[PDB]
């Protein structure tokens, strides 16, 4: 055989415990060394002490919870995983909900301790975290250092020895897995896959099972790590297909590639459209007009296959965009890439997230995805639902306290609280996303000075007191200020949003008067003198 000698594997670890250094030193050992393509499905030849040469496949994984979904689809590719912990923080949030993911996907753990060199290292301590906290073998636990190159050996060795090999049957209907892609100028969207049945090739009549879309198949290969055109694809393998795809929406990760002619009896499993999270209404800055923007933003779609927008209006601000993100990291992430890659100025509303809104005389529900949209009439609001998150948090004993008393102040209901070791708790919140979204990413980690991490998962709507507040200025009401939030926290709101006008406006003559309505009711004022 041969795919007896194929290993597909993943990395996965917190932020900055060394994901990348890592793999470059993989690749590097193994000797995998402008229309350039990021790092994704790439496969190395191995040498093993056992004498045998395997074929193993590097799948790159998302670390940031907004692509969770994303996450998973990478890990279904895999038969197993290295998950990587810096021996000087430990276990953090991200290690914990990966190495669940990992789990979930029946794939073989196997945990690596990195940065052995720094002097704060602490590999004792881990590997208890790993036994108490992960239930793993702290003896099958591997020592390195991707800085140095200490341990690559030992763990493309594990990679070998402990991944079992992909299962799957070249002779049968293909069924390829979607777990990545991107836009090619010249190959078009392409995709790049986990071959579990069949074999494809140049040529072949492909089908999407989600759409029941056909496509003639124009190549196929992996990255070695350039993206190197193969003859084809078998069972078992991990690379990428073109085939003359117009967009990344038409290979949504997670679907599932077969042949039009013979279709494989079902798609792989767990298949999930995109679902924005957050929204945010963006509009031009500066000089930068409303054509540059959504030129930009078009532009830009062509390489995302979450983001969705549509055209939006604001008396003050004038025409802009509603953009819908997966979450903050995504929001930014496009934001960076506008401003640098377009070279677009654009000014940016505070997010929120999609509400749920039942009207009297509306049968059905309302998604409120622009709070200007919110019924301006409370009266006639029968109820709103919001969604809430399950927030995990990981943090050195010291800071529980000012934890739990941030929490508590953003609604949220503790759930469990555990120990990691003696000096770390280990910390569940069910929390309302729109809490979380506002500034509780940097007030966690101010309070923690950076050493608390958490993360956090979708657990559905729940019904929940809120309101929209209106935004005044010299009597002006900016609807692109207004916001929903819940009923007993509206005051306090009121207070930071004015104040954060108050300094956000430029010091000028008349007299600027800033005012936060709730329902015509002015519930906080401030204004910022006149010069002179
Ligand atoms: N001392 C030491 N530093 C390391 C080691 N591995 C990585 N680093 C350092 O840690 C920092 C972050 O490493 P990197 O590999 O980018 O982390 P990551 O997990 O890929 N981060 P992200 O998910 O954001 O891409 C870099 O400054 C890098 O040089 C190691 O074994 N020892
Ligand atoms: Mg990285």
Same mark, same amino acid.
């Given at each position: ?444 980690? %101010? ?5 608390? %991490? ?9 019904? %929940? ?68």
């Amino acid at each position: 055989m041969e795919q007896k000698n194929v290993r597909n594997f993943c990395i996965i670890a917190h932020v900055d415990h060394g994901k990348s250094t890592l793999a470059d030193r993989l690749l590097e050992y193994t000797g995998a060394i402008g229309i350039t393509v990021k790092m994704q499905a790439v496969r190395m030849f191995y040498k093993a002490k056992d004498g045998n040469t395997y074929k193993l496949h590097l799948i790159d994984t998302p670390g940031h919870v907004d692509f969770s979904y994303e996450v998973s689809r990478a890990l279904a590719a895999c038969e197993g995983a290295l998950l990587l912990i810096d021996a000087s923080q430990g276990i953090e949030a991200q290690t914990v909900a990966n190495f669940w993911k990992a789990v979930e996907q029946d794939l073989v753990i196997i945990p690596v301790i990195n940065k052995i060199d720094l002097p704060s290292a602490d590999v004792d301590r881990v590997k208890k975290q790993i036994e108490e906290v992960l239930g793993l073998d702290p003896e099958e636990a591997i020592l390195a250092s991707a800085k140095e190159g200490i341990g690559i050996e030992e763990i493309l060795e594990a990679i070998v020895n402990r991944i079992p090999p992909p299962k799957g049957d070249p002779q049968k209907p293909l069924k390829a897995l979607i777990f990545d892609s991107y836009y090619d100028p010249y190959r078009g969207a392409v995709a790049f896959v986990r071959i579990f049945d069949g074999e494809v090739k140049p040529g072949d009549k492909i089908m999407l099972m989600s759409t029941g879309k056909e496509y003639e198949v124009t190549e196929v290969g992996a990255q070695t790590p350039k993206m190197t055109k193969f003859d084809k694809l078998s069972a078992g393998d991990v690379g990428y297909i073109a085939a003359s795809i117009k967009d990344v929406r038409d290979i949504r990760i997670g679907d599932t590639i077969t042949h039009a002619k013979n279709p494989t009896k079902e798609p792989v499993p767990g298949f999930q459209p995109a679902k924005p999270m957050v929204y945010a209404g963006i509009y031009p800055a500066e000089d930068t007009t409303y054509e540059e923007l959504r030129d930009a933003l078009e532009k830009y779609a062509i390489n995302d296959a979450a983001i969705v927008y549509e055209p939006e209006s604001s008396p003050a601000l004038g025409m802009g965009f509603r953009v819908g993100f997966l979450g903050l990291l995504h929001m930014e992430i496009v934001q960076e890439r506008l401003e640098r890659e377009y070279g677009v100025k654009i000014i940016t509303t505070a997010p929120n997230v999609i509400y749920r809104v039942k009207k009297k005389f509306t049968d059905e529900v309302i998604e409120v995805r622009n709070p200007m949209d919110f019924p301006d009439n409370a009266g006639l609001i029968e109820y709103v639902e919001e969604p809430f998150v399950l927030v995990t948090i990981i943090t050195p004993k010291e800071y529980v306290g000012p934890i739990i008393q941030l929490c508590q102040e953003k609604r949220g209901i503790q759930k469990n609280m555990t120990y990691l070791d003696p000096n770390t708790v280990y910390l569940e919140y069910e929390m309302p996303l729109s809490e979380i979204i506002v500034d509780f990413h940097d007030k966690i980690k %101010s309070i923690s000075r950076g050493f608390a %991490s958490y993360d956090y998962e979708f657990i559905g709507y729940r019904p %929940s007191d809120l309101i929209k507040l209106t935004v005044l200025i010299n009597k002006k009401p900016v609807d692109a200020l207004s916001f929903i939030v819940h009923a007993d926290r509206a005051q306090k709101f009121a207070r930071r949003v004015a104040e954060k006008l108050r300094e956000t406006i430029p010091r000028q003559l008349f007299e600027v008067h800033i005012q936060v309505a709730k329902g015509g009711k002015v519930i906080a004022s401030e204004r910022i003198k006149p010069l002179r």
